[PDB]
Amino acid sequence: TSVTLQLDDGSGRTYQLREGSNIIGRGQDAQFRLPDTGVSRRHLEIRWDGQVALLADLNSTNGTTVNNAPVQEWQLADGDVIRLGHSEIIVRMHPL
């Protein structure tokens, strides 16, 4: 299975998940950096093990929603919409 995050801001920016920890946030150390000033420096983590993508909010200032519902941890699926700050990320999860 391959998993790509698609930033839905017009930029066409994407990030393919690595196995293990993927940090999304505004910080320089994030694997996928969003400059959105409402995004925490370490905002969320997605753990990928080749089968399951498990999102966790990292005690973020503004929270994380999946498909418009606030979440702490969430098992992601193809097409899920993650909202953080004013940004939206579409999950693209496709079996080979």
Binding site: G38, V39, R41, T61, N62
Partner: peptide
């Protein structure tokens, strides 16, 4: 990489 703005 300022403090996050609260929404």
């Amino acid at each position: 990489t300022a403090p996050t703005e609260k929404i």
